[PDB]
Design an enzyme around this catalytic site. Sequence first.
Site, PDB file in Angstrom:
ATOM      1  CG  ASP A   1      18.822  -2.825  -7.770  1.00 46.13           C
ATOM      2  OD1 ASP A   1      18.295  -3.851  -7.288  1.00 46.13           O
ATOM      3  OD2 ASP A   1      18.464  -1.666  -7.461  1.00 46.13           O
TER       4      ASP A   1
ATOM      5  N   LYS B   1      25.971   0.462 -25.220  1.00 43.22           N
ATOM      6  CA  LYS B   1      24.675   0.174 -24.653  1.00 43.22           C
ATOM      7  C   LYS B   1      23.797   1.404 -24.820  1.00 43.22           C
TER       8      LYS B   1
END
Lengths: 319, 301
Positions: free
Chosen positions: A239, A111
Amino acid sequence: KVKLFRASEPILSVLMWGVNHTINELSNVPVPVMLMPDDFKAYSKIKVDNHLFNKENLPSRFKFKEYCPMVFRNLRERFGIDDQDYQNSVTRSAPINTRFLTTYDRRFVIKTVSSEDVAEMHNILKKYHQFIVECHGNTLLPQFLGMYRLTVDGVETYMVVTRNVFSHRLTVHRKYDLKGSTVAREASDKEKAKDLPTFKDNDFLNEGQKLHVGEESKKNFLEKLKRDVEFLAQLKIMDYSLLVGIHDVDRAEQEEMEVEERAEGPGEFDPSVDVYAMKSHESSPKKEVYFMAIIDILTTVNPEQYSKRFNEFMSNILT
Amino acid sequence: VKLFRASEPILSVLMWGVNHTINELSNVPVPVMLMPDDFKAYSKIKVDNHLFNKENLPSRFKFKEYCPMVFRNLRERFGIDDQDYQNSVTRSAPINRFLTTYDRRFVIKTVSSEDVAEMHNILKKYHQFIVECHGNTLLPQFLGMYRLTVDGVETYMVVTRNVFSHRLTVHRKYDLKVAREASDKEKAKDLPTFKDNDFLNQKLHVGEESKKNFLEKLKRDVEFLAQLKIMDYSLLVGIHDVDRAEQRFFGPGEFDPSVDVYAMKSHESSPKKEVYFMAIIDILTPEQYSKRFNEFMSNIL
Ligand SMILES: Nc1ncnc2c1ncn2[C@@H]1O[C@H](COP(=O)(O)OP(=O)(O)NP(=O)(O)O)[C@@H](O)[C@H]1O
């Protein structure tokens, strides 16, 4: 046995080159009895300025930086990953796909992240490594295997390598990203019309989906979840999501037979490899395999509250 | 594990660098031919390590390899495998600027920046000469050329094949090229470097057989060198004395001619049984010196 580092874009080939280089150098570095504090502040940097040489696939000029390589090599070790294997799956053929890649064999995920993410990693790395060691690598958390900065055409690009939540061989037929949060998360019209939509909380709820995995797996999973989410809460982190992939065994048997006809075990996996995989209950309706893990831990509610709500929603995910 | 432990950090960087560039070359295909860019080309890498792998290497250093494709090809044309070259530089530190590899197969010579300029001026003609003479010469065999940066200072090095055997002890040495001889202050050394007037006043006989091949080779070499306007070079002679060496097992006077490429066995009609080594050295810093050199070294055998 040569390695051309051929790739669709120059920075993929630089990635391959750098993983290859750093894993080789590391092979020349003895394996320490213990990590020391400055291993957590350490890095390696190389700058390559070739001229009229070896520029078929690599750019003539690039930089490669690895963060805390002693610590990530250790993490690889504690996650049951051989360095040769890691190297090979990054460098034997180009990874395929800010940006999101997979190694050609689908073991690892790469990523692109930001400066800020790299910072978050440095400040949580000691506590995360201590977590990984006292839970023996049994965690729903992301398994961080390496962290790099590439410089190509004077542009810097930060990347983190992580184990694939999904199986490297079993096909994912459905997937959800669940946060358990108070205000509505449904998947988009654009996303829902995509090929494999990433569904969200309310999609899961209004699909009435349950996940039958049976007692021993349910307990192992929920205990991992309690420990992980309290770890994150105490790091003051929020989150994050639980990623849930569903593999339909019947559907894959048909898909495989269709490709094998066009050529004119089943729903079983290696838990040492597909480390997040669980088979459905022996008394389950359709034979299925699920893959469930926490993701996005780098970047009304406080993190202790986030922990609480997340744990409740995920524990009610599955019978 | 290849720890690059060495006397000086510069030797650690050299070991690291040869290892690195040869491994990288093993990922570069062997071309059907060299191209002109290969003669204008280099690799350069800068290492900046922070609190990592500092145990034997400098944390910061640079390594530059001139014309890697050319020198890998020359290595092949000199019959030297890249893995072997790598092993001779990397597996243990070179030893005594003039070094040899730990196995004494290769010489590592520190060199001026102008020498590197002269090497880039002669390298293309020198490659095609190595081609046309199918790699049998007495010229120095250039195996690689590097620029090292450790602690801010640059250091240039040329790696070449040892003239002397990497096994057989060499007893007498001669550097033959105006009369020059060895000095009383050099005379008090272990293995003396004696010059041509010391020699003339080390009686070398190899037979009628090998002399013909040897001097065909030498004439070809120094004609090419003169054509290059290169002068003031040497022929290096070494003498190993078998009987003295005597006073599972290698044998006395036993050598691999594929490794000790310059070795040359005794004739029968020779007072003592010896093996001798001969080759042209120091060609990097006119025709008169072509002719005088040829005449001397042939009347030396
Ligand atoms: N343009 C640049 N050229 C060269 N080096 C740079 C450049 N920009 C940033 N760097 C360096 O690369 C580092 C990596 O970026 P960054 O994401 O801030 O890491 P960091 O979190 O500050 N490292 P750490 O202190 O261990 O937590 C920067 O801190 C600088 O050290």
